[PDB]
Nucleic acid binder design. Structure first.
Length: 423
DNA sequence: ACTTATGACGT
DNA sequence: TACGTCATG
């Protein structure tokens, strides 16, 4: 029934904003955003506080337009180094959180602000120590139970939260709830503690989803935000999916989800239940069909990968429109700038994480191409040397220039290090 | 003129 | 390999 595992998805609420708010107290509890590259239209927003979201301010919005929506908005700019955005501060804060999470359970870093947590073993241990012990509501002070309450206090959201938690707990206590339900509940108690440790030790608040797999846990995470956690049980899946737009499910937010909607003639996740697996496999392929068939039933098997460390390290800069690189010197100079930041990051990785990158991947985008990458070429990464890496990167891609000039001018340079080896 | 990074799959 | 494409933060 896909109830074997307990899995959490933890997400740092507007993480870059929190990092800035911790460092500059004046920014706390105010409509706030983090921007990069202020010159063009105030710069683009990459993180927005909840106070600012109320005004309709979103990420990937220009700061000048954001100010139109929210006149009182406070802006924090990303550190700029070597002519590009420098995210070191956020990566460092990110590592702080992952270390704390690591003490409680097995974690998979999903991005800079999120991680999956496999709590199956952790739950098993707690159960033995806590045998025969009722689970107080006091253990779950920020937990919402999806689908509850069912059946004056309720007008307030905290009123709703309490009643749902009480019905849920009373039903476990009674013996009405299944064994996987108890596992999730203990998982949630563990996550409350993990979240309390994170805030105490970093000052950072975060939301979490708790469920039996990654898709459900990620879904649950978004249900009650910010600074709250949501338990989605197997039993809640039918009602939850019944009105749940397909594009909301992890991995269905793009072309596949669109074609599932377009080919099937449906809009909600639960509608997928009417199709046989073979029907779904014939439309979308063996793997996707199988995965769809199981997912609409709340079943998903992707494991939480024990991996706190990124598999690749990289940096990129965009040169949109008129700023597109059109000279040899410009291309070399920017490759150098990128290779310089890469070196610093690689060396830090080497001393901290006891591994070295062995392959250098160069990606570029040319003017007139919509695709994220127009071209990708690799070469050996023998020495963590910015001048060598930059020069090697040039060698592999120089043949791309059709015709001291460069054309078609590049709208993108990307350097990425891959294939890490223990040492 | 939404920028900057990652992880994973198909071939 | 792109080595290239998809999906997401």
């Amino acid at each position: 029934t896909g109830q074997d595992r307990v899995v959490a998805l933890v997400d740092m609420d507007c993480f870059f904003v929190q990092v800035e708010q911790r460092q500059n107290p004046h920014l706390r509890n105010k409509p706030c955003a983090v921007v990069q590259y202020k010159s063009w239209k105030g710069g683009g927003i990459i993180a927005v506080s909840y106070e600012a979201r109320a005004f309709g301010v979103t990420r990937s919005m220009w700061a000048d337009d954001a100010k139109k929506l929210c006149p009182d908005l406070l802006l924090a700019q990303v550190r700029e180094s070597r002519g590009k955005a420098n995210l070191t501060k956020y990566r460092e804060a990110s590592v702080e959180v992952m270390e704390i999470m690591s003490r409680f359970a097995v974690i998979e870093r999903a991005s800079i602000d999120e991680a999956y947590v496999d709590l199956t073993s952790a739950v098993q241990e707690r159960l033995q120590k806590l045998q025969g012990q009722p689970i107080s509501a006091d253990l779950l002070p920020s937990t919402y139970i999806e689908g509850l309450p069912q059946g004056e206090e309720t007008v307030q959201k905290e009123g709703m939260r309490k009643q749902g938690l009480f019905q849920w707990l009373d039903s476990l206590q009674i013996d009405n709830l299944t064994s996987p339900d108890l596992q999730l509940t203990v998982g949630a108690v563990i996550v409350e503690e993990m979240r309390a440790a994170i805030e105490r030790e970093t000052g950072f608040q975060c939301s979490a989803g708790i469920s039996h797999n990654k898709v459900l846990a990620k879904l649950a995470c978004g249900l009650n935000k910010p600074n709250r956690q949501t338990l989605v049980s197997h039993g809640s899946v039918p009602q939850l999916f019944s009105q749940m737009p397909i594009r909301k499910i992890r991995s269905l937010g793009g072309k596949l989800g669109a074609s599932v909607i377009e080919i099937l003639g449906i809009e909600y996740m639960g509608e997928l239940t009417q199709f046989t697996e073979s029907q779904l496999q014939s439309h979308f392929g063996e793997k996707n069909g199988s995965w769809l068939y199981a997912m609409c039933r709340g079943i998903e098997h992707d494991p939480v990968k024990p991996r706190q460390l990124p598999k690749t390290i990289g940096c990129s800069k965009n040169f949109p429109g008129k700023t597109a690189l059109a000279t040899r010197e410009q291309v070399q100079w920017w490759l150098l700038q990128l290779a310089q930041e890469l070196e610093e990051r690689l060396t830090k990785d080497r001393n901290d994480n006891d591994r070295v990158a062995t392959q250098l991947v160069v990606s570029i985008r040319v003017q007139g191409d919509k695709r994220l990458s127009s071209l990708r070429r690799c070469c050996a990464l023998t020495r963590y040397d910015a001048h060598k890496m930059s020069h090697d990167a040039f060698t592999v891609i120089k043949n791309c220039n059709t015709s001291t000039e460069w054309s078609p001018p590049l709208t993108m340079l990307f350097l990425c290090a891959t294939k890490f080896s223990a040492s």
